[PDB]
Amino acid sequence: GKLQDVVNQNAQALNTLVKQLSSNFGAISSVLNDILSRLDKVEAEVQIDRLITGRLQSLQTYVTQQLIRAAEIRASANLAATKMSECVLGQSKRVDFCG
């Protein structure tokens, strides 16, 4: 599970990023085609701006969470490299470091 949820933390983020495409964000609809087929240029712009702002905020949120998780994974990988160097490649006198 200590590995598995990591995968379950990465597939769930992309799925939520896809499912956030079906959001109005205050616009009339969540579909660019509906807005561009029902409204003219001057009046669909205020709806497309809402959709663009919402989806850009969604992408920024996803990237921020990915950066947080990448920092945590990098800390774990640094620990794993230290374990490999100090216990596989040698013998460690540190208590409870390796077993």
Binding site: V18, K19, L21, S22, V31, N33, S37, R38
Partner: protein
């Protein structure tokens, strides 16, 4: 008949539309055209304008249905209002293309990695018929090398193994060697 315009009679007609997922009952005066498939076009079915490529498929729509969505609330498929045929909409763009290059002041030569594709169906995944010929030389050729990360066109594959400069993925790397050309190889551990 001699009263002021503020008290003259007026006739008001108020029209109400619904625009549902139902067969179209009233339409605009815009006349139809001839359907073309497997080509990046702007379509307009029942007053639903979109952009993409159209393929014949069978998604088994309900009889009182016109379009089918997906989990991203995009038009996954539409029904032809004249031939009663269930078409299929695929996005024109192919995000998932990588350009592998040396420095700009080294060569104007690039290799193109197409991700998770099988190299025979590259021209129908890129739509190479609608591209400029400078793209169409990069879709097919004799430099096609199939990797586990899609496949790579524009870099010859050698059986030797070196330490690698440009990592491509799935163990495949690329470099700019010797006239001068881009080579791809399995990375040497």
């Amino acid at each position: 008949p001699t009263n002021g315009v503020g008290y003259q009679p007026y006739r008001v007609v108020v029209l109400s539309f619904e625009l549902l997922n139902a067969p179209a009952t009233v339409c605009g005066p815009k006349k139809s055209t001839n359907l073309i498939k497997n080509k990046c076009v702007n379509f307009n079915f029942n007053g639903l304008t979109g952009t993409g490529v159209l393929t014949e498929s069978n998604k088994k729509f309900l009889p009182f249905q016109q379009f089918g969505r997906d989990i991203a609330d995009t038009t996954d498929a539409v029904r032809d209002p004249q031939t009663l045929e269930i078409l299929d909409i695929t996005p024109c763009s192919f995000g998932g293309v990588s350009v592998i290059t040396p420095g700009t002041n080294a060569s104007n030569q690039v290799a193109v990695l197409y991700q998770d594709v099988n190299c025979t169906e590259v021209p129908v995944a890129i739509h190479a018929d609608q591209l400029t010929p400078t793209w169409r030389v990069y879709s097919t050729g004799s430099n096609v090398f199939q990797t586990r990360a899609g496949c790579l066109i524009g870099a010859e594959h050698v059986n030797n193994s070196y330490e690698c400069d440009i990592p491509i993925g799935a163990g495949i790397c690329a470099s700019y060697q010797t006239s001068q050309s881009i080579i791809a190889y399995t990375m040497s551990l």
